[PDB]
Amino acid sequence: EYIENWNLQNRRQRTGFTFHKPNIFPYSASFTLNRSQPAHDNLMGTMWLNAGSEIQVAGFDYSCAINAPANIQQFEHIVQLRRVLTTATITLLPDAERFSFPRVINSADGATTWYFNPVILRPNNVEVEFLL
Amino acid sequence: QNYGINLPITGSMDTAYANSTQEETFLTSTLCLYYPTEAATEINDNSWKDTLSQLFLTKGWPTGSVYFKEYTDIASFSVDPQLYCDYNVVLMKYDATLQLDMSELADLILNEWLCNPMDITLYYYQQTDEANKWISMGSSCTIKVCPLNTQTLGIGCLTTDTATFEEVATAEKLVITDVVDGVNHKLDVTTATCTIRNCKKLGPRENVAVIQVGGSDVLDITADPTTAPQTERMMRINWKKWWQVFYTVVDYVNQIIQAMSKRSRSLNSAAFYYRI
Amino acid sequence: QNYGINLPITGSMDTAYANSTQEETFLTSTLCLYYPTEAATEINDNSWKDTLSQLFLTKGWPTGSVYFKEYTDIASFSVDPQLYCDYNVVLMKYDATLQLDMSELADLILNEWLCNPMDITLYYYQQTDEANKWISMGSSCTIKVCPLNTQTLGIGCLTTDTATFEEVATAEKLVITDVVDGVNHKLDVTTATCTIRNCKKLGPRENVAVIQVGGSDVLDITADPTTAPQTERMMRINWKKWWQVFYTVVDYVNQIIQAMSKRSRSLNSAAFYYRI
Amino acid sequence: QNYGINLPITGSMDTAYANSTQEETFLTSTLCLYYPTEAATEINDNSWKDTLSQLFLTKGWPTGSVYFKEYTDIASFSVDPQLYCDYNVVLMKYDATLQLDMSELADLILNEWLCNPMDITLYYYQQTDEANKWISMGSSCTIKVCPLNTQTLGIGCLTTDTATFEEVATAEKLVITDVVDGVNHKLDVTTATCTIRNCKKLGPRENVAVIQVGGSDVLDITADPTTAPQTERMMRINWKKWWQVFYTVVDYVNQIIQAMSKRSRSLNSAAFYYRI
Amino acid sequence: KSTIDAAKSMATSVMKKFKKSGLANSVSTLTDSLSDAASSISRGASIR
Numbered sequence A: 001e002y003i004e005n006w007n008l009q010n011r012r013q014r015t016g017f018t019f020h021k022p023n024i025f026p027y028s029a030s031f032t033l034n035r036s037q038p039a040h041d042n043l044m045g046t047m048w049l050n051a052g053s054e055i056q057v058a059g060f061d062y063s064c065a066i067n068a069p070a071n072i073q074q075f076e077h078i079v080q081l082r083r084v085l086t087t088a089t090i091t092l093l094p095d096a097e098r099f100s101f102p103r104v105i106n107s108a109d110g111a112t113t114w115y116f117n118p119v120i121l122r123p124n125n126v127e128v129e130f131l132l
Numbered sequence B, C, D: 001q002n003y004g005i006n007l008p009i010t011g012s013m014d015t016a017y018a019n020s021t022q023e024e025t026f027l028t029s030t031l032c033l034y035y036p037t038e039a040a041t042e043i044n045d046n047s048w049k050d051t052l053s054q055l056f057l058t059k060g061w062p063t064g065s066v067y068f069k070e071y072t073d074i075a076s077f078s079v080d081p082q083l084y085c086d087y088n089v090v091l092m093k094y095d096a097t098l099q100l101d102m103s104e105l106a107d108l109i110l111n112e113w114l115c116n117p118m119d120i121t122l123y124y125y126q127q128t129d130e131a132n133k134w135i136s137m138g139s140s141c142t143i144k145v146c147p148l149n150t151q152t153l154g155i156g157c158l159t160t161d162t163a164t165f166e167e168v169a170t171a172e173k174l175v176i177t178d179v180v181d182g183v184n185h186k187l188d189v190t191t192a193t194c195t196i197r198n199c200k201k202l203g204p205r206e207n208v209a210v211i212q213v214g215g216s217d218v219l220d221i222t223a224d225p226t227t228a229p230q231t232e233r234m235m236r237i238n239w240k241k242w243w244q245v246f247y248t249v250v251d252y253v254n255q256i257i258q259a260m261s262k263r264s265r266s267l268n269s270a271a272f273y274y275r276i
Numbered sequence E: 001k002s003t004i005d006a007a008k009s010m011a012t013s014v015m016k017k018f019k020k021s022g023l024a025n026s027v028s029t030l031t032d033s034l035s036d037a038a039s040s041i042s043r044g045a046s047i048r
């Protein structure tokens, strides 16, 4: 496969490598707090881990969207692949077990630590878009 | 620098913790201690302020930063309680007959309130949502309310005769009135000696902690009957001697401040949201 | 339609949430409010019932759906609490000297009891398991107990001589008696004035909530000393005026009803299991 | 259960019969025997209850499972009948004069009813369907009826003048009024000594059996003139001595219980389900 | 069959009950839902 791809690419021909669990996502465990405060008691945001071929994301609201317009809070996560993937089989599951247990998490600047105590609800209006 | 907009902040897990900032905040913060007069009376030592200051210095605080404010009792302290220190600690003596007054005081000082003025002689007032209350403070504040129907006529009362009004507060130094939402009420308030304001509970006030000295878990800082939360800033202490109480406060000042945080509404970063 | 037999119910973890049914339940259900006589005395109004009905109408409850029932006090109310509305809210004033009684009342009306008759002087009685208690109710319940050994001779008591019986209740309007399980007891009860029933605690009663007005968290509805569960149907509020209490009950009726559920034992689904 | 009540139960026509559960039923059940005072008077023994309990023990029931309740007469028993045990056998003496009262008592206790309050002084009441009746119970229930028309004016009666009402019950302890369906009526009832409820007959009450002592088949538990069903729970015996009656009840308790189905015992002992 | 003195309000008599019925309520609910959906940029997440 590799020499065939080498020769095809030398010929300016369309060739591809088939990967099982491609290692396309650089490791990154990070969070974004769309609503926060110094005491970190009423937070709203997203947590995610992108490792290899695996993405886990979890949008959290501490208030459970009590004051949100129509009691809905919208979370969005965009992962920009560094290369174009084709004919990709993808398993989608409705829960991120990585962000489903109590955690003590550093702050953005590392000044302090905040507490996360998830109670998992079913995600609503799940739309997964693959864009080129 | 961008003060009017709420921008999301992206933090990364695995970012190394910063060293302890407890020493730096102790050196660059002020602590206010609110105690009743009976505490000083029992202690009976004109120099106890200096002793407590030196003990706090042994605990870290510079010897110019701990302030001791004295109040006669819960009822008097509830009239315009002004807490200006970076960290406020209030020793509140428990009385079994003043449970509601203690709860009202804690609700007023343990939470942030955004208050607009009220002209009961001019407008009929209504509470919009659960976060809205009518907070009134004064020497003697008596509040009576007459709910009005859609036709502005009173319900169970006559707008012309205040004698038929339903009395909700009598000779109160502080009272947080919660009426049915979405209903206009005609208000009769003894404005001559008390001020009423229409307030919203923005959220917790993190720089004020209350130690209930010798009681039980009775504070209810939320008007919702189904919730009586015990936040980290409301502690309880058994006591016989006030010197022991103050020694416990001094010795566990680290934990007490840990339970508290810098006032979110304060400091520069809160500019152009409500205050500074 | 398949009454009297339990069947598993299968559901998917992605079935869409249905719209709020709170409006429909308020429209098609009844609410009973139980308050002491002193509440009406302090309110000092007679149209207050209609005022509260209108205020509830502002909260969605149709006129006439909300019922107001009155009781003299906890002791008199405990004789035979018969709660019939779809949703029952009981305002219970706190008194330390009546603590246990309050608990008993809660224990009686926050739980479902399957009660059989007891005929003392003709049968000895054991308590089979944890859930088995002896509920005595009447004008004046005086219960004395004589535990027996395997040979039917009393332990520390004489079967013939009632004066040696161990006295467990004196002139009680309501008492929940818990004795050692597996031991036969001879019972001496004032049958002419009280009635004693052998009851099994099936489980919680979800349509009855108790709001304790004033005091601290003292209710203990489980006989087990190691558990004191403050369930969501047991609420506590601080008070000084009854009008404020009723306004709090009306305004937060949504939360109060959320804490409650339809009586599982009742309604058509639970047919040919016990009732209906 | 309730989430599986409206689900099918599938069974094959070859499942092996289980062993006899009569022993297990007797062990885990309680039996209530309702007899008139004349029975006890004729027996004239102070230990006949203990004798019957021992005989039932010979028939398999545990010792403290059989209970005996005494009523003065049919009319007295009909005022708020209370059915306590899992199985309720009622020994009803036959009188050729109290035929309708016997039928009314049997209808009340051999069927499950769903009753609601009636405020006769405020609202005009009608019966919706053949299952809807008005059950009145009290010391003296005198019910008079005034049917109305589309214009609300009475027919054969004047709403203002009660003397023109069509009396349907006089000096009754229990009465089941059946008026023409779909017609509004205005009712005059002695509310001081009477309580009238709008009741719907849900179906049979299979844990209550009635043994008629003497007479012929006169019970009519159906308001419909065209049907007078004799159910398995409507036994009839001929008697000369009450001791023989009780011996027959004890000996054929197997058959009596086999004609009754358990799980029909409500949580409450009342003869009807009260709903507001 | 036109019992005169009742034809004087027959169409309006039926309409008065018609607009209070479930069909009228459903029509109103549909119109309100369409209006809110049109008025909503981000207030449409409520719409399954």
Ligand SMILES: *[C@@H]1O[C@H](CO)[C@@H](O)[C@H](O)[C@H]1NC(C)=O
Pocket: B019
């Ligand atoms: C933090 O503490 C460590 C270990 O005590 C020390 O080496 C370091 O200089 C301190 N300051 C900073 C800014 O890391």
Ligand SMILES: *[C@@H]1O[C@H](CO)[C@@H](O)[C@H](O)[C@H]1NC(C)=O
Pocket: C019, C020, C023
């Ligand atoms: C649907 O939910 C909304 C939002 O709570 C509510 O206003 C409405 O009454 C509910 N019912 C219907 C039929 O739209």
Ligand SMILES: *[C@@H]1O[C@H](CO)[C@@H](O)[C@H](O)[C@H]1NC(C)=O
Pocket: D019
């Ligand atoms: C049922 O009866 C049979 C026949 O006597 C016996 O062998 C068996 O143990 C009994 N019990 C059960 C549970 O089948």
Ligand SMILES: [Ca+2]
Pocket: B100, B101, B104, B172, B173, B174, B175
């Ligand atoms: Ca007060």
Ligand SMILES: [Ca+2]
Pocket: B156, B157, B164, B165, B166, C045
């Ligand atoms: Ca009034």
Ligand SMILES: [Ca+2]
Pocket: B127, B129, B130, B132, B178, B179, B180, B181, C251
């Ligand atoms: Ca309110």
Ligand SMILES: [Ca+2]
Pocket: B220, B221, B222, B223, B224, B225, B226, B227, B228, C236, C237
């Ligand atoms: Ca509360």
Ligand SMILES: [Ca+2]
Pocket: C100, C101, C104, C172, C173, C174, C175
């Ligand atoms: Ca008691």
Ligand SMILES: [Ca+2]
Pocket: C156, C157, C163, C164, C165, C166
């Ligand atoms: Ca003894």
Ligand SMILES: [Ca+2]
Pocket: C127, C129, C130, C132, C178, C179, C180, C181
């Ligand atoms: Ca026991």
Ligand SMILES: [Ca+2]
Pocket: C220, C221, C222, C223, C224, C225, C226, C227, C228
């Ligand atoms: Ca306990």
Ligand SMILES: [Ca+2]
Pocket: D100, D101, D104, D172, D173, D174, D175
């Ligand atoms: Ca009769």
Ligand SMILES: [Ca+2]
Pocket: D156, D157, D164, D165, D166
């Ligand atoms: Ca007549």
Ligand SMILES: [Ca+2]
Pocket: D127, D129, D130, D132, D178, D179, D180, D181
């Ligand atoms: Ca009829």
Ligand SMILES: [Ca+2]
Pocket: D220, D221, D222, D223, D224, D225, D226, D227, D228
């Ligand atoms: Ca018939």
Ligand SMILES: [Zn+2]
Pocket: A033, A036, A040, A106, A107, A108, A114, B011
């Ligand atoms: Zn942070």
